[PDB]
Amino acid sequence: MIPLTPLFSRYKDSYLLYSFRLIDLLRASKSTHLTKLLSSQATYLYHFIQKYEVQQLIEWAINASPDMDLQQFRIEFMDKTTELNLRSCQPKSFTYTFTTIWDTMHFLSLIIDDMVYTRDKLDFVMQQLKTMKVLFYNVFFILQAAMARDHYMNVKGFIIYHIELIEIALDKEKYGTDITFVDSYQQETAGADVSNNMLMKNLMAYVSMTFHNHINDYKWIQRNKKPRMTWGEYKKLLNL
Amino acid sequence: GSMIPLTPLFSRYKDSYLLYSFRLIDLLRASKSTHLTKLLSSQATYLYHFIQKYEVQQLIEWAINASPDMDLQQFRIEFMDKTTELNLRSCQPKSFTYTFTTIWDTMHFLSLIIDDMVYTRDKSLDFVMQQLKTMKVLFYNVFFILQAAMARDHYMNVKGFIIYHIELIEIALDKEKYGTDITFVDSYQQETAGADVSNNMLMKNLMAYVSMTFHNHINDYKWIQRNKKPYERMTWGEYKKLLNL
Ligand SMILES: Cc1cc2nc3c(=O)[nH]c(=O)nc-3n(C[C@H](O)[C@H](O)[C@H](O)COP(=O)(O)OP(=O)(O)OC[C@H]3O[C@@H](n4cnc5c(N)ncnc54)[C@H](O)[C@@H]3O)c2cc1C
Numbered sequence: 211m212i213p214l215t216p217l218f219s220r221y222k223d224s225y226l227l228y229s230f231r232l233i234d235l236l237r238a239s240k241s242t243h244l245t246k247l248l249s250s251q252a253t254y255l256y257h258f259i260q261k262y263e264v265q266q267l268i269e270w271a272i273n274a275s276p277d278m279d280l281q282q283f284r285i286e287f288m289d290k291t292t293e294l295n296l297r298s299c300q301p302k303s304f305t306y307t308f309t310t311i312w313d314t315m316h317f318l319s320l321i322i323d324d325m326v327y328t329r330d331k332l333d334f335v336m337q338q339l340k341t342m343k344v345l346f347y348n349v350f351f352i353l354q355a356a357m358a359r360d361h362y363m364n365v366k367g368f369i370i371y372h373i374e375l376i377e378i379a380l381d382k383e384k385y386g387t388d389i390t391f392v393d394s395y396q397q398e399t400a401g402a403d404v405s406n407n408m409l410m411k412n413l414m415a416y417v418s419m420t421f422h423n424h425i426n427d428y429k430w431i432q433r434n435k436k437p438r439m440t441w442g443e444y445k446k447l448l449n450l
Numbered sequence: 451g452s453m454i455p456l457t458p459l460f461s462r463y464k465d466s467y468l469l470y471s472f473r474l475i476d477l478l479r480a481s482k483s484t485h486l487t488k489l490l491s492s493q494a495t496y497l498y499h500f501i502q503k504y505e506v507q508q509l510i511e512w513a514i515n516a517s518p519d520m521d522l523q524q525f526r527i528e529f530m531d532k533t534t535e536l537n538l539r540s541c542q543p544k545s546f547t548y549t550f551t552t553i554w555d556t557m558h559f560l561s562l563i564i565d566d567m568v569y570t571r572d573k574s575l576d577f578v579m580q581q582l583k584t585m586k587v588l589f590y591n592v593f594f595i596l597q598a599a600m601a602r603d604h605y606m607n608v609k610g611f612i613i614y615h616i617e618l619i620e621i622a623l624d625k626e627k628y629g630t631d632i633t634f635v636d637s638y639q640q641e642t643a644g645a646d647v648s649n650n651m652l653m654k655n656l657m658a659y660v661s662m663t664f665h666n667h668i669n670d671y672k673w674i675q676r677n678k679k680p681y682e683r684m685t686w687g688e689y690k691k692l693l694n695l
């Protein structure tokens with residue numbers, strides 16, 4: 211039940227592009243550990259009948275020839291998803307950038323807010339958040355970005371931590387105290403300081419927005435240089 | 451000059467910090483790889499960093515060569531003599547009882563040191579900024595030492611939370627190098643509103659509060675992990691009072 215907007219459609223398509231670029235690495239995996247974590251991630255991304263057909267796609271990517279180039283792999287993937295009734299998995303644009311990854315993280319963020327606001331009063335949603343944590347813990351850049359990978363590796367806990375707050379909030383609700391949805395991040399962070407069960411509406415949209423801003427502020431430190439998205443602007447763009 | 455207030459609690463913190471540090475260099479004789487040797491001895495060097503430097507190198511080098519066949523108690527005795535011979539009796543801990551609270555006290559200790567370096571900076575701003583990078587490496591590489599697989603996995607999912615607030619201070623001191631002085635605010639909410647704008651607001655005692663909030667979060671999450679229903683939590687009011695902040 212996420213609002214349909216121009217930006218959300220781009221998020222949707224970057225999400226597919228990101229997922230396609232991930233199962234393409236599977237044929238190149240240099241270890242069983244990497245094979246396991248790539249295919250697991252891919253299975254989770256598409257998760258957010260269609261399950262069984264998604265297993266066939268992953269299994270196709272695992273055996274796909276290492277000797278194809280990306281273009282060749284794209285062609286065989288378009289056919290496979292056509293034969294598996296998964297044209298919906300097909301990305302419209304294949305131009306892969308940092309914004310593809312951002313759009314994916316923002317997409318997941320909106321999925322989370324949407325599951326918690328349309329929850330049925332629960333173990334299900336709480337299992338979905340664990341999966342979400344593994345997806346955020348394990349974001350692949352795919353593109354060459356040594357400095358970006360290490361930075362994210364350092365501060366990704368910021369996002370995941372807020373996913374754990376939602377878990378605590380739903381644990382409180384399965385045990386009597388319902389969630390009170392508040393409008394700001396500040397009402398939530400004050401309420402932690404005491405019972406109460408306040409959860410910011412659209413929490414992960416905001417969290418990944420502040421996070422996105424933080425990475426862009428911090429990169430004027432990483433290259434010595436003297437130098438944004440506001441929450442109001444972001445809600446307007448996404449119809450939150 | 452550590453302008454940190456002297457408190458009963460802050461004295462425990464300072465002793466657990468030494469206990470933590472002592473238990474860390476004890477592993478060096480048991481390191482099964484060059485990588486862990488390198489990361490353990492770097493972490494120990496940095497921990498003691500918060501001339502004392504040359505004697506701390508001698509201590510670390512002594513621990514790298516220490517016999518793997520000693521027991522902890524053996525290593526403790528040889529450690530006490532070594533620090534005595536190196537004029538580093540201030541490195542010697544008073545209580546050797548090592549628990550989870552030892553680790554908490556160490557992370558809280560480091561948090562106050564960060565707040566203090568920033569409170570008492572000299573517009574040394576390069577200096578403090580390089581200290582915060584080192585701090586990020588200490589929080590990224592927290593060792594449990596004791597057996598605790600589940601705490602270790604949880605910490606490595608959410609440690610970015612702490613580290614992210616260290617980058618805020620970094621960004622704060624960076625725009626202060628470039629003109630906009632830091633404005634200090636008393637609550638975490640004022641700072642969070644300020645980020646959502648030219649402004650350069652930073653909470654007084656930010657990392658004390660961030661580590662206290664984080665401490666509470668782990669204890670909240672542990673009741674999901676073991677599946678129960680929970681209790682008096684630590685509040686920022688009484689934490690400031692306990693530490694005379
Ligand atoms: C997890 C991750 C970690 C990264 N770490 C680093 C790093 O350490 N060092 C480095 O130099 N680069 C890093 N990058 C890349 C960096 O953030 C930018 O993508 C890069 O600098 C390209 O510049 P840009 O302005 O076009 O990107 P961006 O401005 O971030 O992307 C442009 C798009 O994002 C939209 N957008 C901008 N800000 C926001 C916001 N707060 N919230 C939501 N949407 C927004 C804009 O509308 C535009 O559509 C990282 C990227 C990701 C996904």
Ligand SMILES: Cc1cc2nc3c(=O)[nH]c(=O)nc-3n(C[C@H](O)[C@H](O)[C@H](O)COP(=O)(O)OP(=O)(O)OC[C@H]3O[C@@H](n4cnc5c(N)ncnc54)[C@H](O)[C@@H]3O)c2cc1C
Pocket residue numbers: 550551553554592600601602604605661662663664665666667668669672675684689
């Ligand atoms: C980085 C780290 C990660 C951990 N992850 C886990 C985990 O995933 N699962 C698990 O079961 N255990 C975990 N633990 C251990 C856990 O946090 C407790 O120490 C453990 O449950 C023992 O309970 P306790 O009440 O005796 O410790 P605590 O409740 O933390 O008390 C020890 C001392 O800390 C003081 N204190 C208490 N609360 C605060 C606060 N919010 N802020 C500042 N000081 C406070 C108290 O005065 C007390 O003296 C972790 C510990 C650390 C240091």
